[PDB]
Amino acid sequence: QVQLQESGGGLVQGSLRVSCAASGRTFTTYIMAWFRQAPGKEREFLAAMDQGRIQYYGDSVRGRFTISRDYAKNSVDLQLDGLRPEDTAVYYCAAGAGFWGLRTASSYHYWGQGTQVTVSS
Amino acid sequence: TTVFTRILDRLLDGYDNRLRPGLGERVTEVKTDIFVTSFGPVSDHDMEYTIDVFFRQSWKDERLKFKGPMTVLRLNNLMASKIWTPDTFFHNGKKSVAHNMTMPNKLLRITEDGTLLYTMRLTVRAECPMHLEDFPMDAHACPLKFGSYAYTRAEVVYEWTREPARSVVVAEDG
Amino acid sequence: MSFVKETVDKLLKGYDIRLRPDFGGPPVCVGMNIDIASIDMVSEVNMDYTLTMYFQQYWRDKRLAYSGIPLNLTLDNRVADQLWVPDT
Ligand SMILES: *[C@@H]1O[C@H](CO)[C@@H](O[C@@H]2O[C@H](CO)[C@@H](O[C@@H]3O[C@H](CO)[C@@H](O)[C@H](O)[C@@H]3O)[C@H](O)[C@H]2NC(C)=O)[C@H](O)[C@H]1NC(C)=O
Structure with a gap:
C-alpha cells in the first residue's frame, strides 16, 4: 500500500513546518x-x-508558505510563516501526475490523513 | 525618406546592450504569449515531443524612445541583434530550432514610447516524462517551461500578455 | 544606470583576454558546479550516454573587481566573448 504520513504541530499562538513522508x-x-x-x-x-x-503557489498564500522536496527521502515539506487566525484548517498532502490539473484535487490520486492546524489570538 | 534613416541611426547612440532596461532601479517586466501552429509528433520512445510556436515577448526600454510622424519602427535583424532582448530559454528543451529560411524568422517592433515587441518562430523539441503504468490506457501532461537563463527573479520577471488561459492559443488545424 | 555603464566600460577597457587572472602569480583556482537537467539516452550499442546539464565555473579575477555597486552584475551573454574563461 502507498501511504503519505504527515508530521507537524497543531497549535500555535507564529511559524510552523509541516512535513510529509x-x-x-x-x-x-x-x-x-x-x-x-x-x-x-x-x-x-x-x-x-x-x-x-518548479514551485507553484496559490494566490492566497503566495510569498508566505514555502514548499520544498527531498527526493532522496521521497518527502515534501511546507514551511508556514505569517500564520493568522483564519488559517486554521486541515492540511492534506497529495501526490500524482497533474492531468487536467496542477491546481485541482481531481488530478491527484494519492492523499494522506491530514493534519489539523489552529491559531489563537 | 531621411527621417527614417536618421531615427534608425540615432537610436543606438550611447546604447549599451550589455545592460538590461532599468538595471539597478526597476525589474524588467516581460509580457509573453505563444501561438502553437502545430503540436508536433510525440515520441514516447524518446519521451519527447515537437512543437512549432510563434513565440512573442514584449517589454519596455526607455533608452530606445524616439519621436516622429511614425508610431511604429521596424528593426532589421542586424540592428535587432545590437540591442538587449530577453535571454529566454526552454527549461525542458532538448534541441530547439530558430527558423532562418529565407531570412531570420523574427521581427522586432518599437513604439514611440519605447515599448519593444519581439516575435520569433521556433520549433522546440521538449522532454515529456511519461508514467507508462497504464499503457495503452495511460494519459500524460507534457510540459513546456521557459524563462530567463541569466536574470533572477529580482531582475527579470515574465508574465502573460492576457489571461493565462488565453495567452497560449493552439491553431485549429495544429 | 549610467554609473553601472561607465563602471563596465572601465572594467572591459584595457582588458587583455589572452592573459589569465594572476598571469605571473599563483595559479587561478576554478570551482565547478553541475546541475543535471536530464540523462536522456543510455546506449548499450554505442557505448555512450547523453547528458544535459547546467555547467557553472567560478573563478576570481582581480582585473574585473568593481566597487560602489552593491549588486551582482549579470551581463549580456555576449560579454563572455570579451573575458578570459578557462579552457575546460
Ligand atoms: C551576490 O552574490 C553573492 C555571492 O554569491 C551573494 O552572497 C551570498 O548570499 C547567499 C544567500 O544569502 C549565501 O548562501 C547561504 O549561505 C549562508 C551561510 O551562513 C546560509 O546561512 C544560507 O542559508 C545560504 O545557504 C552565500 O553564502 C553568500 N556568500 C557570500 C556573502 O560570500 C549575494 O547575496 C548576491 N547578491 C548581492 C546583491 O550581492
Whole structure:
C-alpha cells in the first residue's frame, strides 16, 4: 500500500513546518502538493512542486508558505510563516501526475490523513 | 525618406546592450504569449515531443524612445541583434530550432514610447516524462517551461500578455 | 544606470583576454558546479550516454573587481566573448 504520513504541530499562538513522508512508491517523477480545507467543505490549493523543482503557489498564500522536496527521502515539506487566525484548517498532502490539473484535487490520486492546524489570538 | 534613416541611426547612440532596461532601479517586466501552429509528433520512445510556436515577448526600454510622424519602427535583424532582448530559454528543451529560411524568422517592433515587441518562430523539441503504468490506457501532461537563463527573479520577471488561459492559443488545424 | 555603464566600460577597457587572472602569480583556482537537467539516452550499442546539464565555473579575477555597486552584475551573454574563461 502507498501511504503519505504527515508530521507537524497543531497549535500555535507564529511559524510552523509541516512535513510529509511518502512510503510504498517513489514519487521522484510525480508532482507533490499541499491542499487546505477549512470548515465548510471546500478544498483549497496551496503549493505544488514538480520533478523540475518548479514551485507553484496559490494566490492566497503566495510569498508566505514555502514548499520544498527531498527526493532522496521521497518527502515534501511546507514551511508556514505569517500564520493568522483564519488559517486554521486541515492540511492534506497529495501526490500524482497533474492531468487536467496542477491546481485541482481531481488530478491527484494519492492523499494522506491530514493534519489539523489552529491559531489563537 | 531621411527621417527614417536618421531615427534608425540615432537610436543606438550611447546604447549599451550589455545592460538590461532599468538595471539597478526597476525589474524588467516581460509580457509573453505563444501561438502553437502545430503540436508536433510525440515520441514516447524518446519521451519527447515537437512543437512549432510563434513565440512573442514584449517589454519596455526607455533608452530606445524616439519621436516622429511614425508610431511604429521596424528593426532589421542586424540592428535587432545590437540591442538587449530577453535571454529566454526552454527549461525542458532538448534541441530547439530558430527558423532562418529565407531570412531570420523574427521581427522586432518599437513604439514611440519605447515599448519593444519581439516575435520569433521556433520549433522546440521538449522532454515529456511519461508514467507508462497504464499503457495503452495511460494519459500524460507534457510540459513546456521557459524563462530567463541569466536574470533572477529580482531582475527579470515574465508574465502573460492576457489571461493565462488565453495567452497560449493552439491553431485549429495544429 | 549610467554609473553601472561607465563602471563596465572601465572594467572591459584595457582588458587583455589572452592573459589569465594572476598571469605571473599563483595559479587561478576554478570551482565547478553541475546541475543535471536530464540523462536522456543510455546506449548499450554505442557505448555512450547523453547528458544535459547546467555547467557553472567560478573563478576570481582581480582585473574585473568593481566597487560602489552593491549588486551582482549579470551581463549580456555576449560579454563572455570579451573575458578570459578557462579552457575546460
Ligand atoms: C551576490 O552574490 C553573492 C555571492 O554569491 C551573494 O552572497 C551570498 O548570499 C547567499 C544567500 O544569502 C549565501 O548562501 C547561504 O549561505 C549562508 C551561510 O551562513 C546560509 O546561512 C544560507 O542559508 C545560504 O545557504 C552565500 O553564502 C553568500 N556568500 C557570500 C556573502 O560570500 C549575494 O547575496 C548576491 N547578491 C548581492 C546583491 O550581492
